[PDB]
């Protein structure tokens, strides 16, 4: 994208995997718009499954 700021936008954009115009009448799933299963996709659950030292207070 064509910016003049060294930071193109405010946040980091996470992709989706949806395939519909977003303003259209066609019914679109909400699970494709964000994907946040019960996995290491969320930070804290990843920290638990990896048993990081912070979840123990270190």
């Amino acid at each position: 994208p064509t910016s003049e700021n060294p930071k193109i936008g405010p946040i980091s954009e996470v992709a989706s995997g949806v395939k519909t115009a977003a303003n259209g009448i066609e019914r679109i799933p909400v699970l494709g718009e964000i994907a946040k299963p019960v996995t290491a996709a969320v930070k804290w659950f990843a920290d638990i499954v990896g048993g990081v030292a912070a979840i123990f207070g270190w």
Partner: protein, 55 residues
Amino acid sequence: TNVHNTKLASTSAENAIEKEQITTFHDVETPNRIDTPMAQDTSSARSMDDTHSII
């Protein structure tokens, strides 16, 4: 055609027979159903125990 949260009145196949468990409905045309789009099970009953039968 593609409308949400409503099923409009329409024609359908001219000889419909829906069989629920023991009741069997004959209708002149196929009923105009509205079901939930992309339905889910928003409960936890299937995780608590198994559904017991009469036996």
